[PDB]
């Protein structure tokens, strides 16, 4: 409990942005004379974070361009201002010996050149030095000076290696805080060369912000809100944090721009990588977002990260916009469409391939977000394996220098979520073991599977695997009660021929059910329904699955207690209307899992291709948080036919494999 | 309409020391002392010179003369005084005034059918002098009057016995200042003029509220009447209650009628205030006439089994009382003359408590009630404005006029859903009349607007045991049971609420005829806790799970009414097989035992247990009772004159 609110805490203080200082950056600053060194805290933070080895950057990863890159541009600031000589050279050894990234092969170059002007031993004549001082020019080749100059570009971000660019134009493509693109040694050296004041006023307040010491990037608003709640719902724990990511979530909305998302809110350049988290986190939470802000990276039937710079796509961005393709509605863009193909493309030919390298364990949170479309991606399913996938501080950052996100890429983030899942767990064993009592003493597998605890197993697993929460056991219970009886009844009528020859006054039965004086009666209302169905039903082709799904919505809107308010006509229709989609799309999975006569691929694959499309326009009705019926039915809906498709979708070894990981296989 | 009702309720909030009409008698002896009396003796005196609507012989002479020696004693307005000189010269020729004999006789000495008026001899001087007696009331009249120690008499108000007439006279012969304060305060009140008796505080209250109640209007104004209520139990002396709480003498009147309605609205109240009143096994009414007894033998009722024995000895008295005079026209009243006496005392006498359904008392009593028609018979003809009222007739026939209007449409809604229910299949042979007796027994008692659910639901539901039952019967029991019944309480409108553990209280209904057949025990009383139950469901109650004695109490209400339902089943069974009136009434006797013990606890009002909960165990048990003792023809001529004879 208190790490909860520890995470609260830290996400109520949310703001600029939680990031690792640059050693880089940080001295790149301190080379900043006096208006009339400009900011010595630069350089006393300079003094005290230098690693045992003699060398700077990030401690916890070494990395060679790391280590080295921001190792010198330390040294260049202290024998520059002729201090600390001590360690100048003490770390001059590291770079020698040592010898043998982004924007590497721009701010490198103009950094040895910057060695030259100071008297610094340094092996220049290395074979690995030619091969990236060949891409300076192979790059400040291919780069148009005259369009360097006419659009904000990812290029600002180093202008310590550019060199006679021209600034009245260049000024004028600065982000909305002065900074040019969000680096403070592109401001530096920006500065250097002109004395805006809008641009010197960008520079000193991240230096009183740290107390001395600048990271790579600044700020990132947009960003670290936007990963930090995925990161949170993703392990589960988001339900605790309902006030403050609905806070922050509001942000992005504000600051949504029909050209896309960027890092952060005051950078007019957009990229593909936030606005594909943006958008899906929006809808998914239920705001109103048109996906043909997407159109804008599309060129040609290809899916770039920038509008304009038709850069090699890396691939966590891809995967991010294939989950946002996921939440795709019916009335949307069809360039969410043309987006979900390319990007399952790009992410399967890589997927046989170790060349999904960019963090802890990203080829497992690919394969899960291919092979469990959205149809079939229960909460508790994803959170299990993602507390397995989760990098913790493990996870880093590939800017101008290895950078770190305290806030979303914390140690105390798994701490707190392994521990409210291994209390469901927990809860979880005993609510089962609760159940089998309840299965046997009422003489009820004798109907059922061939295997009945695999029957009661499954059964209950799906219903705790989407309504997981502390308090609903109520629901939880009920759902896999009214299951049981469901497949009990059915197994029983399979092999008699029907309610034809239905010996027993079977109605009752829902007195297994024990019971509450709110929910017993209504509940044998429901279950008189699913028994009328069977009768109208019987003597047709139509299935009875989608009756026995509508029911169980119908039992689980019982308990927890919320009635639907009739009076209001379009309360009345969205709820009948997604009745309809839930009756409609569990009947058409059982006709694939008939299909499944177990020939025509094409059949099949005729039968998925609709399934998913009616499954977007309830995805739809479900998510609209404009919608007139409430959220909690709404998702009652959503979770029943969820594991409905799960089923369908699954065989029973990956199915109980599941069982094994989410509620057996221990977490701590 | 709710426009009576408000009228009505701020004549109770404005209640006080009473709303009374003048006396001319007394007020003239004001005349003797003087100051605005006269001046409302001249204003108000009637045409023919003289009460007013009940010309009455013994005393429209002294209405009328107290108006001469007053006017002609000051000599003003003669006109008129002998405007009435005449009427009364030409008039002078058991149904006699109170103090009469003392208060003419005295009242002639200032000026042959009269040469009758010997019975001021029969007073014991030394007693008259030494506690306060309701001679105190008349003593205008009085020779050998030794004041030393008749102040010390006197009520607290100065009065003595709440007469100014005895106290005017009190005045000629001690000018004393605190007898002066009464006198000037009660012609302040009524701004000229005074009663022959003030103040009327208890009294007056009681009454009101008894009135009401029976009226079956008293639950319009249950903050009204609990706020004067309040004021009876404060003013409450373990030697009894007065008409005024500062009257030392206490009577059997107003105590009868305090304990009656103090028990009946849960206040505590102990019945052994009675024995003050016992001499010798005979029930008088100081420390006796028929209405009185009634009002006691009403109270009486009432009996709780841990009371004093004083109400034991009180019913078996006044039953007597009334049954020796039942059939006389000796039903006439000394105290006071009223439109149905018999009436409200024959049903008191042929109905007790058991049997005594809300619905049925009030709507006889709307055509008993005799409104203004009645009059009290003091030392003058006086009327009560407030509570022998016109109005409250007007207003109680009306909302009981919109409960038979509402119970005719509910009728309707019982005869459909009977009929398309295929309930009829059984039943008796004549379902119709089983149909009508159960509505009845449910509207009897929870009658409210408000309450429908219940009602309906309570008579629904007690039609399914009907139906089964005799179904029961006419297979030969629960042993070959061919069908499935506890499919039936689906047949009642499915209620989320109520349909869930309705259906748990019939299942279990069922069992106790699996249980208790193979047995000699009759189900009439797992059929009443049936109906309970129910009742309770429509009504949404529940008990307060974590409280032990409410459980506790609880369980013992089903116990009672379980076992009073049991015994009743057996009085109408064995008075089937005429088993002898002395064995039969054997059981009668030992119902009014468990009866009390309810009765008890229903009205105990203070436990934890909601009142509405307790109510409907008197309710169902008392429909219960009814039935066991009411002839089968006296049962259509209640429902016939409770819902079709229309009043208005």
Known sequence: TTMIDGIRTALRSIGEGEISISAYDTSLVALLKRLDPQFPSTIDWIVQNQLPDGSWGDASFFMMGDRIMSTLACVVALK????????????????QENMWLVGFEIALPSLLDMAKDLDLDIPYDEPALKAIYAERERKLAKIPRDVLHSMPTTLLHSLEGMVDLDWEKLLKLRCLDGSFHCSPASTATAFQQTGDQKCFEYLDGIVKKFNGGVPCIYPLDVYERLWAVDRLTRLGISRHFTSEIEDCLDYIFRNWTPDGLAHTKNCPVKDIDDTAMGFRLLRLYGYQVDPCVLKKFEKDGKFFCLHGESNPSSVTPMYNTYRASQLKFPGDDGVLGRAEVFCRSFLQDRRGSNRMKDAKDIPGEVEYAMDYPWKASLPRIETRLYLDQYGGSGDVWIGKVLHRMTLFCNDLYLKAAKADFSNFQKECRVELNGLRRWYLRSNLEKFGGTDPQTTLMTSYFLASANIFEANRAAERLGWARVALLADAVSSHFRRIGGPKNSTSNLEELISLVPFDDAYSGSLREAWKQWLMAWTAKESSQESIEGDTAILLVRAI????????????????????????????????????????????????????????????????????????????????????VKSFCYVAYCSPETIDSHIDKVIFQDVI
């Not at 520059?80 to 770079?95: A, M, P, Q, V, Y």
């Not at 309360?571 to 499944?596: F, N, P």
């Open 557 to 640: 809107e019982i308990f927890g207690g919320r009635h639907v308010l009739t009076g209001q006509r379009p309360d009345l229709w969205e709820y009948s209307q997604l009745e309809q989609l839930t009756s409609s799309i569990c009947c058409k999975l059982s006709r694939r899992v008939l299909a499944q006569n177990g020939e025509s691929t094409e059949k099949v694959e005729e039968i998925d291709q609709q399934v998913d499309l009616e499954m977007q326009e309830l995805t739809r009705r479900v998510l609209q948080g404009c919608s007139a019926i409430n959220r909690l039915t709404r998702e009652t809906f959503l979770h029943v």
């Open 80 to 95: 520059s201002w002729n201090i600390h000589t001590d360690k100048c050279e003490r770390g001059l050894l590291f770079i």
